[PDB]
Amino acid sequence: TTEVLPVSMTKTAVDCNMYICGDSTECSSLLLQYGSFCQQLNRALAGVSVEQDKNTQDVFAQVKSIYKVSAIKDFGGFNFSQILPDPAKPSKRSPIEDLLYNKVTLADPGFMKQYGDCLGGVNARDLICAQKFNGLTVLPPLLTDDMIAAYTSALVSGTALSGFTFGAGPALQIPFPMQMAYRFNGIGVTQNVLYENQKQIANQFNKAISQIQESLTTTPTALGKLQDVINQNAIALNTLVKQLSSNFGAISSVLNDILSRLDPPEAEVQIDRLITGRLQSLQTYVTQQLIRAADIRASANLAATKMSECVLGQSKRVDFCGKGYHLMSFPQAAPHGVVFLHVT
């Protein structure tokens, strides 16, 4: 059975001056008299950004040894080929993670970082370009996808070598069918029922993992908690840009048209109605982001505890590692999240 859990969201950063006043010395001078609203709106966003890396580090990097096992090896009838990285093929990921990474429509990888240019090659008008021209930037994660996928290959090849001994100390080698007999003893069943029907357990197991592929490659949904994380970031970053087009009750939404027709005393009553609306929009954006981060942190903590109790142990908790009696679990990397395969 599968289980999907989000772990992180995109990191954003805002320049107050560029968003509120643009390139206007006059406006800038006035913003100074509204106080520290802007060195306070940056610290919150920085904390949210530094929390997202610790979220990933608490889920994937809890074993500091890299174990390696060939995928074409026998293991007593168990294939383990669609979960361990390919040997020759260039990819450093596995046959299931490659399919997971082709079912989420990430939103832009970075124009000037993807053969893009917001000058001339701005197309009709790329959303990304309007964001950068207005002070909104997206920062890359610290752990790379090729480097997250290395932790998962050392976590599946550690349970094909030692069982769950790598999670309490040094790895202690054991034959695989001898490890599966220890796990049958854990749910109340004697050791002989595995040795006597090994060839049918090694076929039901093999057929079940070969059917997760063709239940994901056809059905578009069920990866529907990872797509909403991307969608909410996109529609919330695009709503902030389209709000610099409102007049909030003044003569225009452009500040260089209030300063080209009114004099220092009457322009200041009209440039206060805009500095007040554009501060409220930003405040709303960050107070909604702070609330979303708290919901992402609970799921990250739950993923971290499932990585410890279901993958580096056998759990006796009933509905924690699947529906039935639990034997094993395998982690697979997914964009912004993790997917657990539970054997029952």
Binding site: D15, A130, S260
Partner: protein
């Protein structure tokens, strides 16, 4: 002209000050608002480049607007039959009105400041002109009542334009100036009524004025040479303005300069002002369009009124810059990261020819202190081919730490790729098992 960060004493004496445009460390100090910085990586604002020169370009016309024709020449009409004229293709240098005999007593404008009239260009101008008496002048304003504002001449509530009035005792003290005094209902803004039909006070019509409940609707002002100051004739002119996306027809007296391209400058195109970088464009406009705006109402394109070519405007600081420091209690060395920028076009993005001398050090390769990562181009650090444990996160698998140096031509901040852990040499076996022999009690 520059901005500085200043620190005061508890008794009130200046004890410190820094210039924010000098070097990256000073920029970080000014952004953080402190004189001592802890260890890490920060995002900074722009204090590097400021505009130096000015680009101002206006249309080619030179002929002055007809102020004499409408102020000294025309014979003026009555208020019920008021007249309108159009002004187009002229320069509005109104200083030529100081040498005339108008002697304005009322000059008051709405939706316009008098001190900006010389820096504005208009898409359309209308001029209405007529004659009233002295006590009726205050009724020519939006939102008023009275006999003139209700039956003769009414301005809309959202009026934009100026109002001028002046005394004409020596030329207009004669008979023949009328105003309407009786009417059923009020007129609407910018409307005229020239009818001269008898008025019946009960609600119908008549066939001869002077009998019971029938009156003439028009009254003569009766100007004489010995009237009081409130019964004198006054000439009134009202100017109405339009400001749209359309060709300029009336512009102020400004001198044009040369097109300077690929530099952070202040610009003025037909009264549209701003600051940024001007480049060539491949966009297309409609025949009577003057500028283009994007989804955030940021003006991105504008045409030149002289050469008729469409140009693009980009901000002077478009991408984010980050600064890496190990602490001011340890060293004054810093490194600079340019996000999503290739190391080949750093000089054209920072505007090298317009920053301080110390800043150009962080834009040239020199002795291998410039190298490329997946987060951007990093300058001021030396790359190491071995891997350590992360200290300061730069991004995309790259971290940085501090190093004491010996070999010269070598930087003091070290950049490296983060290590995931140590390898293990445990191999699979199908007939052997490892069992512990002793144990350890840990707290």
């Amino acid at each position: 002209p520059l901005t500085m960060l200043v620190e005061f004493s508890p008794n009130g004496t200046i004890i410190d000050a820094i210039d924010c445009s000098q070097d990256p460390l000073s920029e970080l100090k000014c952004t953080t608002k402190s004189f001592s910085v802890e260890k890490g990586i920060y995002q900074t604002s722009n204090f590097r480049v400021s505009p130096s020169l000015d680009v101002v370009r206006f249309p080619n016309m030179t002929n002055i607007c007809p102020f004499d024709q409408v102020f000294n020449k025309t014979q003026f009409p009555s208020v019920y039959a008021w007249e309108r004229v159009r002004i187009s293709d002229c320069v509005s240098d109104y200083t030529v009105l100081y040498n005339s005999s108008a002697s304005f007593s009322t000059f008051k404008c709405y939706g316009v400041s008098p001190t900006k009239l010389n820096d504005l260009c208009f898409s359309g101008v209308y001029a209405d002109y007529f004659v009233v008496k002295g006590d009726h002048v205050h009724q020519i304003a939006p939102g008023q009542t009275g006999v003139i504002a209700d039956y003769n001449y009414k301005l809309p509530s959202e009026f934009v334009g100026c109002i001028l009035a002046w005394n004409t005792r020596t030329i207009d003290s004669k008979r023949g100036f009328y105003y309407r005094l009786f009417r059923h209902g009020n007129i609407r803004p910018y409307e005229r009524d020239t009818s001269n039909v008898p008025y019946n006070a009960a609600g119908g019509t008549c066939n001869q004025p002077g009998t019971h409940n029938c009156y003439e609707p028009l009254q003569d002002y009766g100007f004489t040479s010995t009237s009081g100051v409130g019964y004198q004739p006054f000439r009134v002119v009202v100017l109405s303005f339009e400001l749209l996306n359309a060709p300029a027809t009336v512009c102020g007296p400004k001198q044009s300069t040369d097109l300077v391209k690929n530099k952070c400058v202040n610009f003025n195109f037909n009264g549209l002002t701003g600051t940024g970088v001007l480049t060539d464009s491949n966009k297309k406009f409609q025949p009577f369009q003057q500028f283009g705006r994007d989804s955030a109402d940021f003006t991105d394109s504008v045409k030149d009124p002289k050469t008729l070519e469409i140009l693009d405007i980009t901000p002077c600081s478009y991408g984010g810059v980050s600064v890496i420091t190990p602490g001011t209690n340890t060293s004054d060395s810093v490194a600079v990261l340019y996000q999503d920028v290739n190391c080949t076009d750093v000089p054209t993005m920072l505007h090298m020819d317009q920053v301080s001398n110390d800043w150009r050090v962080y834009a040239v390769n020199t002795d291998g202190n410039m190298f490329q990562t997946q987060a951007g181009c990093l300058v001021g650090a030396t790359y190491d081919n071995t891997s350590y444990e992360c200290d300061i996160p730069v991004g995309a698998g790259v971290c940085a730490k501090f190093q004491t140096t010996t070999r010269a031509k070598q930087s003091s901040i070290l950049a490296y790729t983060m290590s995931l852990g140590e390898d293990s040499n445990v191999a699979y076996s199908n007939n052997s098992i490892a069992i512990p022999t002793n144990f350890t009690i840990s707290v």
